[PDB]
Symmetry: C5
Subunit: 205 residues, 5 copies
């Protein structure tokens, strides 16, 4: 009951008893992105759309979510609804339908102020699967990034350029030949723009 009271007090202190309005040029934020590809579900050659199921790991850190575990019964982290906090507007740049969310929208917040949010998603995106019924397979790509924040407000990075394939569905209609995730910088507008480019080579299993 004390642990419960401690956690409710912590969330009340963080969410009620102090003010974050999003990143700014004077208060920029770095968001780390990683993809865990679970399934290429469908590849449509009549419309050049491919459907992926993946987990999108998002990580950032805010001073305003920091606390001393000693003041709160040594609580070092908690889970909370993603709507309780600010989250980055990371968006697929060439989707062809609204993303469908497959998991609870809940984030893990740690006492250092770091946040980890890992929504599972089904995404339809622009992809010509020509060659998927061949040895070399097909190659397609999709960029992810902020919709409204330039690189002066949100910077992106990956922890690795190799997409996590350890959850890829063993009996998918498609096998993965390779999957990479790479930070890109592009420069109308003075400010740089950042994305992570997800590149997937695949073929019929």
């Amino acid at each position: 009951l004390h642990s419960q009271a401690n956690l409710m007090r912590l969330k009340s202190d963080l969410f009620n008893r102090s003010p974050y309005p999003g990143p700014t040029k004077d208060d920029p934020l770095t968001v780390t992105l990683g993809f865990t590809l679970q399934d290429i579900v469908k590849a449509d050659s009549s419309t050049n759309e491919v459907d992926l199921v993946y987990y999108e790991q998002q990580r950032w850190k805010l001073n305003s979510l920091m606390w001393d575990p000693n003041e709160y019964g040594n609580i070092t982290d908690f889970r909370t609804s993603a709507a309780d906090i600010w989250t980055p507007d990371i968006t697929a740049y060439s989707s062809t339908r609204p993303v469908q969310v497959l998991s609870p929208q809940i984030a893990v917040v740690t006492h250092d102020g770091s946040v980890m949010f890992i929504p599972a998603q089904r995404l339809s995106f622009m992809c010509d699967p020509t060659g998927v019924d061949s040895e070399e397979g097909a190659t397609c790509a999709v960029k992810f990034g902020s919709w409204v924040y330039s690189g002066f407000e949100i910077d992106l990075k990956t922890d690795t350029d190799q997409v996590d394939l350890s959850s890829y569905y063993a009996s998918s209609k498609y096998e993965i030949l390779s999957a990479t995730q790479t930070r890109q910088v592009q420069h109308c507008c003075p400010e740089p723009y950042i994305d992570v480019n997800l590149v997937v080579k695949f073929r019929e299993r």
Copy 2:
């Protein structure tokens, strides 16, 4: 009218929980009742199930003495009025579609019974389904964000309840099991728990 006043007062009292923690872990019991394998798509390797899920847990903070409330021992309430566990399928390919009202039953000892009916599309190769051996598929269910140190999953039985399986389904069930699994990941010492639903079926 006195019973109505008592129930309204109980609910006000109770509803005026941050989730479990390592220090205050919660056990959630899970069971499945499979009603129908509706569809098996060999072009996408997606299979569609209709089932309902029994979910049960207990909170001291939902406890009350009936004698203080007209001998009310339980009530029904919107699932939005209370914390519910984030039990999720780990290999769905579409958002789950809910077939039953989001209402749970709370009992005076603090226990909660929630029974969501769902249609689920999940990753499944139906190869063999037109053969004597049939096809076999599996989908894990568990917390999305809590480890086995915060939410422990249990089952009452490893037999999926098939007593309400639709007798004229396109697919007959050869077997269906629900098995608690303890999973570890090389990075971390803490256990993760899921219930693995394994279904063997054929046309």
Copy 3:
């Protein structure tokens, strides 16, 4: 004309008193009887590849609460009113063998009468478990679906019908399917999960290609 302004005032006041100055659902001590009746409009689709059939129908629901009673004389002789279904408690009447979420085809509005009775008539499209084998034959196909509370046993919600005959007077005359018979029967239903039975109304439809 001042009469009209007065009637509006009486109704806003009645609604304010009933909703703002005052139902937690039925209990064992205070159980509720819901009357159900179906009006079947159309069998839209019968899918033999998945054994799902799609129905369009109106489901009439009626119940009565003391907490919704008023004296018409205290409120300018208002004897009933329409209100959003979200303003009041409604029963969780659920198809027990749907294969998709029901789709609502009519406004979520109910009629409340001064004796505390409520009438609510949702139009729905429902996909449910049904093997249409035989539909291209003279005998046709037969399927059934139960409707009842999801969370309330017979000790909290009872159901009744006014008739066991489904109303076919609005059935679509150029449907792909003709109705041979449609019945609606109250059942006391025992589930191995639970010592207390649930009440359902069993909708049994015999139909064939027109």
Copy 4:
């Protein structure tokens, strides 16, 4: 000067919004008109046809009247359809929930009249047999209040001719005729009349 016109509008909306629907004592008339844009498809396997149209709805409330001279000569304003009461006009033989294609915003005028024009895609019960013949196919669907009788809400049309001037010239289907006709229905049980507008469309493969 512009801040004044804005202040006037905001005050008017405030005055007006700071109505329980019609009653037999305070009944209401809704004028309905259809502008048919497209027959998108016809499914002979299910006898469902899909229409795209916008539906003009007009009614008048004393409680929405104001004097333009008291409010900077504001004669009308636009407002979210959620800020006001709107009639529960429903298709009686749809087979899927209507899909709304336009913003849910209405126009309120100083004489208390409200104009709301939802664009919709509708699937409804229709046998397209004959659509590939000179005579074409004929189908119909009634629209009316779901919960209000003719004692609370009357319906009417300005014309019985459906507006076809915006009908898609390259639709897969051409319209031979389209009418919208007020119908009154009485029943021996009940003393109250029931009103609908019957949309009748005759159409043919182009």
Copy 5:
């Protein structure tokens, strides 16, 4: 150092105060006495699908919307030199720009967030998937098919909302190189029409010419 940390806190406080002063200290939409000009431009990303059985074609594009309100102006010097901010599109008035011949509800593909600048100008760029009325007959030809769809306010006439374009050329620099359909031309043109009614009505007409492969 501590000063850098304090600056960031100040910057956050300044933003919260700006948004507070703008929003909950104090737009009812345009009026005949206060007309608004919305600038529209399209960036066409993909013609996904052309259905000859229903004459519906599906587009993916993003639609840049821009307008300017006196009531959204502020002096940057009064707010730590903040010159613009991002905010939820639900925090502010937005124009009801609607496609006039869609056949399904538009599907939104991007975050509903806008950028507000100190001169009171607002920029909002929703990405959308749209199904609209279009006979793709000719798509399998050298000159391709031609389809058009008008965009404009649903409820405001040209008395209250005017439209303009910065160019009549649809932006094709992000068009999907491996689409099933190649673009032959794409234009966006302001029109004044009538429907009966004294008020003139304004739209922007998107005309696309495209063919297979």
